[model samples]
Target: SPEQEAIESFTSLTKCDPKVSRKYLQRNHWNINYALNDYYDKEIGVAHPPVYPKELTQVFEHYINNNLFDIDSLVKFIEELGYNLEDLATLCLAHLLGYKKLEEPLKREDFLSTWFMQGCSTISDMQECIKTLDVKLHEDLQYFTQIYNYAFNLILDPNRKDIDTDEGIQYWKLFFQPEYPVRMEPDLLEAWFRFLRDEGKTTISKDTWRMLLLFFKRYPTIQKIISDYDETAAWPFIIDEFYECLQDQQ
Candidate 1:
């Protein structure tokens, strides 16, 4: 009875799916006010306006018509629009279209649909969109995990049918930069990847990739953990070896 009443009040205030609201409240340890704050962080000021076809043409002329428009160019263009490349707006747009690596050329439809027509007409709108997207990613774990697997698959080996070591290393760096760019020690991270490549590891297992991602984010003291890791443990061999490699480092 109390739980239901709490849910009803949260729903009334936030106007979100009851299940979604309940989950947020749960994540906030059942504190309805904190949950409402999370909801408002994403929802406030993010009401997208209606789209028009002519706006697409205008967007093209403004950003993409005169150039090849790769990530660097897009960064410069958006900067000209008064947003930094590292802002949530740019990162959000990049992630939305799998442009995380930013080397791909811009497409007319993608620019129009993903950016312009989505009512991302100004820096303010981009900020709102970023907030909304952050909520979606945080609330939808299954979808976020799906995106994670898809991103690894796409970046680690675009061809999918075959895997390449060099390309895998390349894309992993690109993916890592934006997410944990300055968080980890560069020398250690570089050493870990190089050790893998030098060990004749032709491709990274998804398990290993995920483990390393976790380690990078949460286990900065990896060597200490690995020191006690069981030799016959169920952990993937590659990941275990990675731990060992880090441990052997001075």
Candidate 2:
């Protein structure tokens, strides 16, 4: 019932051409795992990509830079699709692709196994995929968090352990903007942002970045946070600083 489907996934995982893909499929009644097993014997295989046809990977050959997908060229490719790195759709796609840094190029394996396998292979397909994901970002908490978590890795210095507060704030709006998943008041957000700006802390660690989001999502009311926050619990220093910042405003 699904010969092409088997060929698609097998070829995708092996990075094999579709003709080669079909050959593998032909031996085992077009069953996916059988072809995949045959492919692994010949090709060192590991994981799956974004979940699309294997044949479309040829599209990447034009963009490939010595077997790697450099970020600059990838950006131009995305621009061809009418989106940029900052746009939620684009970033959502990046998150799906699992970008580790803003400046780093993507491995061919990751892009193939983790990216195109998602069922998108062409430029038009990618545009549609991003547009669909953009809508989910607006309404899906789980989806938003997936992108949110990936967002941290996007801005990481790679050479350093922490990110600049201002740099991190650029991502704040992606989750905190109107109709957001993390519910909080404007003044609270204002206090947190302004406090970080004027106060002693100039950088944010993964702990602070995560807990701040956890703190914001967990406690919507500043009053409960003020009275209910326990001192004994181990939290990043910025949490206390943010509390004090709010305290000053009250």
Candidate 3:
């Protein structure tokens, strides 16, 4: 809720003026030029670091540099086709979820663990731990089950058929579903297309599913790049800075 509130507050400020950016950064150590850039050392400010493997500024940089999937444009196109921003933001939320979804088992594990708990010994352990924290979370599974329904309807909305985003929109809608599903499917490619079909609803043709299956069958190569930013040192600082910036926005 805080994240949503922060986003809303930020959006509200965007309407008033750009002045908030200066105030938001006064106590924070972050600076942005369309993408986030961090100062090497700062404390107790909006532009500060977060508590994680990367500095908050670096994380923001990554989101600007990598996390997006040309979504704002896609959302805009969807809107011009007659959808409202609220509906678009909602459906696009699913699409964003799928786009941000990682393909690797490890990243999936890490993400699920971080969101669900402070720590996780294993994904199952994380799931169990989350359920223990709140019985309502168990009910949340039903909401996840509905993601494909929401996403596909967004894609197939009759009014917006003029927009030819099938390739890109569906690509991301399918790309990130694994993160929300029961678990990553055994054949990662099959898992992907099954997502396109929403696990075989008649709405999607079998041919598309088959094609996507074979096309993505090869396991993507994993690369390792190490940095020496001393994340343990930077984590709390970056997130705290992010919150400080968020506070200014609020």
Candidate 4:
């Protein structure tokens, strides 16, 4: 019984720390087996190198002044160290900053802590570390989606009240165009995007977007859930209506 087997696996793994287990389990797209593999692998892997706050601060100071957190300037700074932006090592650094595109600027603290001090003394070291991260992402579709969701948070410009709709669409394009492990129909994804921007008549809230991701992952056929939906139940109106739209399409 896979169902009973799964409960047993989940129970034992989560017994000591359910919260963390739940997070990592979800990161693995609810795959208990992969979650366990990730857990043990990380435990034995090379420890994250030590970081110095003052040294990181010194590196950041040259870039952070005047409230101009420009990606090009950061690239130039790294280029001085003989690493080009095309290097996977540099791309890994950008990923740490939560950067999905060249136009986006990373948070200063993200650079100082996550990048500057993590013991990556050379481009090769950074490349190796990022490859580990990439493997984890590939092993866990749930983690990939979570990181994708987090990337949206980095794109939020505090100087502006809300993200531009056009810019938001670009983010969606980057996320959906990739050959990620989590599977969803390309057409259905497009439809969902159109509905959010057009029919829903609102910008995508982080909560709503995450919910949609969960829905897509949880319901590959989608109609299965539509068939089970309780119209008068306490589920959010938006979710209910989204299902309704799917039903209408069918």
> Taking the tens digit of each residue's C-alpha lDDT, what string does model 3 give over 96-153?
3343322111122233325334444333443354344333322345554344344444
Instruction: List runs of model 2 lying over 4 Å from the truth.
Output: 1-55, 65-68, 113-116
Models 1 onward score TM values of: 0.47, 0.70, 0.24, 0.53
Better of 2 and 4 by lDDT: 2
Superposed Cα deviation of residue 42, candidate 3 (Å): 5.3
Q: List, residue by residue over 14-50, the lDDT tens digit for candidate 2.
A: 6555677788788867887887877676545455552
lDDT of 4 at 151: 55
Supply candidate 1's per-residue lDDT for 76. Answer: 69
lDDT of each: 0.60, 0.73, 0.35, 0.60
**RMSD value for candidate 1:** 16.6
Candidate 2 global lDDT:
0.73
Leading candidate by TM-score: 2
Off-target runs (Cα >4 Å) in candidate 1 are: 1-50, 53-56, 61-91, 98-110, 116-118, 122-150, 156-158, 161-187, 246-250
List of clashing residue pairs for candidate 1: none
Candidate 4 regions with alpha-carbon error over 4 angstroms: 1-69, 75-118, 159-162, 176-181, 200-202, 232-235
